[PDB]
Write a protein that binds this ligand. Structure first.
Ligand code: HEM
Length: 291
């Protein structure tokens, strides 16, 4: 099963920077969402979930086909809440109808990370919509109530190693768990709409207690009002993960560089890029453009 990137006809860097900018401008404008967290975190999560269905063994799932637009995937219990990100992107897609669904969903994630002051994430165009029967079944996204061995094995299916897993998980600095979506409640820290290495700092520095939430699920809580999922906390229970958590807690730049690599890889898993494909694009932020 081969998915060849095909550039939207006649489009180039400038066209995608316009789409970036529209997303970024709406991120700034629609600031009220989720008690003023804004849409950044949910857009990052959407980009991850549309990519995280990939299976390296047979190249099913993955961002290429844009299949989140079909009800089977839209309604995956694992994706509860992401409809808010999709709705955000609707007017963007209406303005730029030429962009593929997979390019739009993944570009939303890149735009959110950069506009939240995260690392630059190189991004490649050319995902092509595929039909409804290519939508992957529910159940390929990870459970949160599990341990380090679960996490490690899970991410092998996405061809991610320990360092890539721990780097990717730093995105959990962003946003919050919502009890009605996932059966977990609370943010992971104070800086949850700016992209930093706070996830690692808080894992190491907060005093965590294993409590039950109102949905009768266990989660790790701090007196400062933060929470970690069991799978988050597993990163400091496993000795190999813990070393890498300490590394990123002590080196912001290294976290940024490793996140950027792992996130681009996640977003590109399953896609074959022709040798004569354009190079990856690095979009300017609104701030860099004076916009
Ligand atoms: C073991 C892997 C992971 C598990 C079990 C997991 C689980 C969760 C769960 C349960 C939530 C809360 C959803 C809700 O209640 O609204 C969440 C939120 C989120 N996740 Fe993860 N996740 C994992 C990996 C990742 C990765 C790799 C990324 C992206 C690089 C990511 C990005 C996010 C973001 C940004 C949020 C906040 C969303 C919001 O505030 O609306 N997650 N995740």
């Amino acid at each position: 099963l081969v998915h060849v990137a095909s550039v939207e006809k006649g489009r180039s860097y400038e066209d995608f920077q316009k789409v970036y900018n529209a997303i970024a401008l709406k991120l700034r404008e629609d600031d009220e969402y989720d008690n003023y967290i804004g849409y950044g975190p949910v857009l990052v999560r959407l980009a991850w979930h549309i990519s995280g269905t990939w299976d390296k063994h047979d190249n099913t799932g993955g961002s290429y086909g844009g299949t989140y637009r079909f009800k089977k995937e839209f309604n995956d219990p694992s994706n509860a809440g992401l409809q808010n990100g999709f709705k955000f992107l609707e007017p963007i897609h209406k303005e730029f109808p030429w962009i593929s669904s997979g390019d739009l969903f993944s570009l939303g994630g890149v735009t959110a990370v950069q506009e939240m002051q995260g690392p630059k994430i190189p991004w490649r165009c050319g995902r092509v919509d595929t039909p409804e029967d290519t939508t992957p079944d529910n159940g390929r996204l990870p459970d949160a109530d599990k341990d380090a061995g679960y996490v490690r094995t899970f991410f092998q299916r996405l061809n991610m190693n320990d360092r890539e897993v721990v780097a990717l998980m730093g995105a959990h600095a962003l946003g919050k768990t919502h009890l009605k979506n996932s059966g977990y409640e609370g943010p992971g820290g104070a800086a949850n709409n700016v992209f930093t290495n706070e996830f690692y700092l808080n894992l190491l520095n907060e005093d965590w207690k294993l409590e039950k939430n109102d949905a009768n699920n266990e989660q790790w809580d701090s007196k400062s009002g933060y929470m970690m999922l069991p799978t988050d906390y597993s990163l400091i229970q496993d000795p190999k993960y813990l070393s890498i958590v300490k590394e990123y807690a002590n080196d912001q730049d290294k976290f940024f560089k490793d996140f950027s690599k792992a996130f681009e890889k996640l977003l590109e898993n399953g896609i074959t890029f022709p040798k004569d494909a354009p190079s990856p694009f690095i979009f300017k932020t609104l701030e860099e453009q004076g916009l």
